């Protein structure tokens, strides 16, 4: 049908705006503490502690199948990487600080990001 071709013309715009989003959230974290998921052979006890972890590759690999279907999934993804870290990782650490850091500047690209979606439609 032509109202699903439109709709998949949709969620191809959002996937556009959403990778552009996500390199934008990626140059906030210059050391790429976040890029990848935390080895389970470096810490091999991590999902006892994290029941859902998360990173920018996988969110990558989510994305270019187009499988983030509006910003609130992909926001909810994000906070996960943040939110991961400050619980495994204490204040005092290089790993917490820059999940602040990261946050606090993320947080202006949403922003306005919300108001391009909603924007945009």
Same mark, same amino acid.
């Given at each position: 049908?032509?109202?699903?071709?439109?709709?998949?013309? @949709?969620?191809?715009?959002?996937? /556009?705006?959403? @990778?552009?989003? *996500?390199?934008?959230?990626?140059?906030?974290?210059?050391? /790429?503490?976040?890029?990848?998921?935390?080895? *389970?052979?470096?810490?091999? =006890?991590?999902? =006892?502690?994290?029941?859902?972890?998360?990173?920018?590759?996988?969110?990558?690999? /989510?994305?270019?199948?187009?499988?983030?279907?509006? *910003?609130?999934?992909?926001?909810?993804?994000? =906070?996960?990487?943040?939110?991961?870290?400050?619980?495994?990782?204490?204040?005092?650490?290089?790993?917490?600080?820059?999940?602040?850091?990261?946050?606090?500047?993320?947080?202006?690209?949403?922003?306005?990001? @919300?108001?391009?979606?909603?924007?945009?439609?």
């Amino acid at each position: 049908s032509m109202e699903q071709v439109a709709m998949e013309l @949709r969620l191809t715009e959002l996937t /556009r705006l959403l @990778r552009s989003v *996500l390199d934008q959230l990626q140059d906030k974290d210059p050391a /790429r503490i976040f890029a990848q998921p935390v080895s *389970l052979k470096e810490v091999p =006890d991590y999902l =006892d502690h994290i029941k859902h972890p998360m990173d920018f590759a996988t969110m990558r690999k /989510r994305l270019e199948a187009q499988g983030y279907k509006n *910003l609130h999934e992909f926001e909810e993804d994000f =906070d996960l990487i943040i939110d991961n870290c400050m619980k495994y990782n204490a204040r005092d650490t290089v790993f917490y600080r820059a999940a602040v850091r990261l946050r606090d500047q993320g947080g202006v690209v949403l922003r306005q990001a @919300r108001r391009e979606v909603d924007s945009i439609g």
